[PDB]
Design a protein around this ligand. Structure first.
Ligand SMILES: Cc1ncc(COP(=O)(O)O)c(CN[C@@H](CO)C(=O)O)c1O
Ligand SMILES: c1ccc2[nH]ccc2c1
Ligand SMILES: [Cl-]
Ligand SMILES: [Cl-]
Ligand SMILES: [Cl-]
Ligand SMILES: [Cs+]
Lengths: 394, 256
């Protein structure tokens, strides 16, 4: 039995080896207790404000929307310590770990941004941190790997499987199954077995809470739509969560379309995958017709999680949120456009959200609409990839 | 219809514990896999636990991770695995055949359809490695509707509510992962659970004898077979020979 519902409609659950059920039951009880605990909320708020730098700004894009009747705001999670929204929830999870008496952190990472957040949280809070990363991702993300190691974390390359994020995810679970008495698994997205989709959401929902209060203050009204990219779902659900009951507010998640949906080389399982059971949850996934899990493809490393949080699949199924995709080329053009016209270098992940907002504005330039895009990270980590693509063309 | 019950009756008639090797189907290749399993049986395996290669075996150690990669390198698919399961059953009508599955391979073409195919090919039991008893309802229902025994792991950190559930929902045998406090083994007998097979750390004949003495109905060697395969990849015939000698050594140790 659980204190909270493990399912969002048909999606979610706790599909783990039996040995891990006590670790999940322990975590859910600590979370429910922490959420009722004023001293926990004050510690969490203190770290977010005084260490991570919240509240983040809500920036109006006026150059971007000129000539249209779109008003565009960016939620600047790129200005968070670490450069991405990941920092919010690792601070909460790291405090959960200490509330459970744990002294070690296990994390998984693909692009390296969750690894870096986990390492900085562990360093701040006195936790020994070990990070699993697919050997191909380690190869390709040596800066983030060096960042993690400077911050005291052990980076462990995972050669098993495809040697990418899903295989690091597997190894992290394997490790936690034997070490959970002393280690806490700091899952990096709003996916996986219950209670992680719930915990991540609650530890990211200040994004949408701040946005609501900031947008009411600046425009006097709620947004027509908030837009965020969807890798595993944490930044999007963090933005969405406080608007879910504001039924006039559109929720739009943007999965990576990669080279295009019809090419098969994409990372859009919510709309173009098939429900499966993997990584502790029942959720849409990238998988073969055989049920072997595949990788997500995207120009942006961060959108590589081959499935999606079960709360998103649920929100889609009841029609509360809409999910679209954006190809590499659309995201790249959005990247360039923001640099040139607002002086903000976005993460190529968040470039997908922006790309969709630009499409909304450009397709219907006389539609009056107030859009908020969640800028999930800064793009300085991506200039090398963008540079190499530009010189491959011209 | 009745293979685990029949085996355990006979084993008890002969003052004996079960020895159950695990191996991955199609490792290191389908014909060599078929040769391996026939050797296990001829050497004295009382039942089989068979894994189907899955891309993300998040509950398996490295020896089995490597076994899946060898099978995938051989092009092994679930469909071909079920062709092997049919051929194995048609060669050996009485040996109980259990699958260790991952939930997604069961869920993929429909849960009930998966267990229907198990029944077609003669599978006796299925353990879904990543489905705890709390999530098991749709799986064990489909299992029973198709006369498959749903197998559950009793882990070392098991509390009383779990022992009750494992005893109630499990069939065929209880997969025990423990260091035998046989407190677990006696409470499972107490709750009339399916006979407990000890699956943790069974790599020598001494541990097979030890598990039976603790009260387990037998032992499962989850890795050691696969290790003997991994070490003898260069020579298929020394592989079959060392498999036979290891399995009979292990089987002779269950004769208490
Ligand atoms: C800047 C940025 N924006 C967005 C995302 C998407 O993740 P989400 O859908 O959980 O928000 C990521 C994920 N990055 C994850 C997955 O690779 C990591 O391990 O670092 C990101 O780094
Ligand atoms: C929380 C965060 C930012 C805010 N700006 C105005 C109100 C308010 C509340
Ligand atoms: Cl600030
Ligand atoms: Cl405008
Ligand atoms: Cl709207
Ligand atoms: Cs995804």
């Amino acid at each position: 039995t659980t204190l909270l519902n493990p399912y969002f409609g048909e999606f979610g659950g706790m599909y783990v080896p039996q040995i891990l059920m006590p670790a999940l039951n322990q975590l859910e009880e600590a979370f429910v207790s922490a959420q009722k605990d004023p001293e926990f909320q004050a510690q969490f708020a203190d770290l977010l404000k005084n260490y991570a730098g919240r509240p983040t700004a809500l920036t109006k894009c006026q150059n971007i929307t000129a000539g249209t009747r779109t008003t565009l705001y960016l939620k600047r999670e790129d200005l968070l310590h670490g450069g991405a929204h990941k920092t919010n929830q690792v601070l909460g999870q790291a405090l959960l770990a200490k509330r459970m008496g744990k002294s070690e952190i296990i994390a998984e990472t693909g692009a390296g941004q969750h690894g870096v957040a986990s390492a900085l949280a562990s360093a701040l809070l006195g936790l020994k941190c070990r990070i699993y990363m697919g050997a191909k991702d380690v190869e390709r993300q040596s800066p983030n790997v060096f960042r993690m190691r400077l911050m005291g974390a052990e980076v462990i390359p995972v050669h098993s499987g495809s040697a990418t994020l899903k295989d690091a995810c597997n190894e992290a679970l394997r490790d936690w199954s034997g070490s959970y008495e002393t280690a806490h698994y700091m899952l990096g997205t709003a996916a996986g077995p219950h209670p992680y989709p719930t915990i991540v959401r609650e530890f990211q929902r200040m994004i949408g809470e701040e946005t609501k209060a900031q947008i009411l203050d600046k425009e006097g009204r709620l947004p027509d739509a908030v837009i965020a990219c969807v890798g595993g779902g944490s930044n999007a659900i963090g933005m969405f969560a406080d608007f879910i009951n504001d039924t006039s507010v559109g929720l739009i998640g943007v999965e990576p379309g990669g080279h295009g949906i019809e090419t098969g080389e994409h990372g859009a399982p919510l709309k173009h995958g098939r429900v499966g059971i993997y990584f502790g949850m029942k959720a849409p996934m990238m998988q073969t017709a055989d049920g072997q899990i595949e990788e997500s493809y995207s120009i942006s490393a961060g959108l590589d999680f081959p499935s999606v949080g079960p709360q998103h699949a649920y929100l889609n199924s009841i029609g509360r949120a809409d999910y679209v995709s954006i190809t590499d080329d659309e995201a790249l053009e959005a990247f360039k456009t923001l640099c040139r016209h607002e002086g903000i270098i976005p993460a190529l992940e968040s470039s997908h959200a922006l790309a969709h907002a630009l499409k909304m504005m450009r397709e219907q330039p006389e539609k009056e609409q107030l859009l908020v895009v969640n800028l999930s990270g800064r793009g300085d980590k991506d200039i090398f990839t963008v540079h190499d693509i530009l010189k491959a063309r011209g | 219809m009745e293979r685990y019950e029949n085996l355990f009756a006979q084993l008890n008639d002969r003052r004996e514990g079960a020895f159950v090797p695990f191996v991955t189907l199609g490792d290191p290749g389908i014909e060599q896999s078929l040769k391996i399993i026939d050797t296990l049986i001829d050497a004295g395996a009382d039942a089989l636990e068979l894994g189907v290669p899955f891309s993300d075996p998040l509950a398996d150690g490295p020896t089995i991770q490597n076994a899946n990669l060898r099978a995938f390198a051989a092009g092994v698919t679930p469909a071909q695995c079920f062709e092997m399961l049919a051929l194995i059953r048609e060669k050996h009508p009485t040996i109980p055949i259990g699958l260790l599955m991952y939930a997604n391979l069961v869920f993929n073409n429909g849960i009930d359809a998966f267990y229907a195919r198990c029944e077609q090919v003669g599978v006796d039991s299925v353990l879904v490695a990543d489905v705890p008893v709390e999530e098991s309802a749709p799986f064990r229902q489909a299992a029973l509707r198709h006369n498959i025994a749903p197998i559950f792991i009793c882990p070392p950190n098991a509390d009383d509510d779990l022992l009750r559930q494992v005893a109630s929902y499990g069939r065929g045998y209880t997969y025990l992962l423990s260091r035998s406090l046989h407190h677990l083994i006696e409470k499972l007998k107490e709750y009339h659970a399916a006979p407990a097979l000890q699956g943790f750390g069974i790599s020598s004949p001494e541990q097979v004898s030890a598990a039976v003495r603790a009260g387990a109905a037998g032992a499962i060697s989850g890795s050691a077979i696969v290790k003997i395969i991994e070490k003898n990849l260069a020579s298929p015939k020394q592989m079959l020979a060392e498999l036979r000698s290891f399995v009979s050594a292990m089987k002779a140790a269950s004769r208490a």
